Amino acid sequence: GLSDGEWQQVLNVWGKVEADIAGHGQEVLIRLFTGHPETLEKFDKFKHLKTEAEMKASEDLKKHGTVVLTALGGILKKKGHHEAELKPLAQSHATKHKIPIKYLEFISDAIIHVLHSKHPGDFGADAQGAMTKALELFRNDIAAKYKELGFQ
Numbered sequence: 001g002l003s004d005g006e007w008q009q010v011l012n013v014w015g016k017v018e019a020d021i022a023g024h025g026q027e028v029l030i031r032l033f034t035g036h037p038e039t040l041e042k043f044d045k046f047k048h049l050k051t052e053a054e055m056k057a058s059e060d061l062k063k064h065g066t067v068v069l070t071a072l073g074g075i076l077k078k079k080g081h082h083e084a085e086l087k088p089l090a091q092s093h094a095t096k097h098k099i100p101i102k103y104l105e106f107i108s109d110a111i112i113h114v115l116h117s118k119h120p121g122d123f124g125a126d127a128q129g130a131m132t133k134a135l136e137l138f139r140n141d142i143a144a145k146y147k148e149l150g151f152q
């Protein structure tokens with residue numbers, strides 16, 4: 001439950017991401033994989049990446065970063081009205097990719113970390129608060145569908 005002022009901040013911040021969706025998506029995935037290496041095991045096409053240099057040099061990782069952040073962007077632009085957009089993601093991640101909700105927490109914090117990293121002093125406290133709440137909303141709604149499916 002975000003206010004209009006908070007969604008405004010969210011989409012304001014998202015403008016930063018959209019000026020370089022591939023760069024942002026790349027660094028988010030890298031921060032995830034290096035900060036929580038067990039996450040890497042969920043990707044049959046990234047499990048080969050041992051080193052961070054390999055991650056950085058991988059165009060397919062940047063491609064997936066784009067896919068992920070494009071999907072997230074679409075969801076964020078719905079300002080909470082994302083049932084249609086979210087349900088298939090929740091289903092594919094629960095039943096096909098088998099991604100525990102913990103990993104969604106991991107990538108949420110990673111998004112936060114990357115925005116500070118790429119925009120130091122340009123990602124204010126109010127913007128962090130708004131973005132955090134949005135990612136929590138996202139997670140909580142996924143979490144509801146996970147429960148429904150009985151998935152851990």
Ligand code: HEM
Pocket residue numbers: 039040042043044045067068069071072088089092093097099103104107
């Ligand atoms: C912001 C959170 C996320 C978003 C918006 C997102 C979005 C997507 C989308 C759009 C796809 C392709 C369509 C599909 O299979 O449903 C996908 C695939 C996939 N995702 Fe997620 N994802 C997120 C988080 C994660 C996390 C945290 C993990 C694992 C740690 C993960 C693991 C995977 C895997 C293994 C695939 C299939 C990759 C492939 O073989 O092409 N996702 N994701």
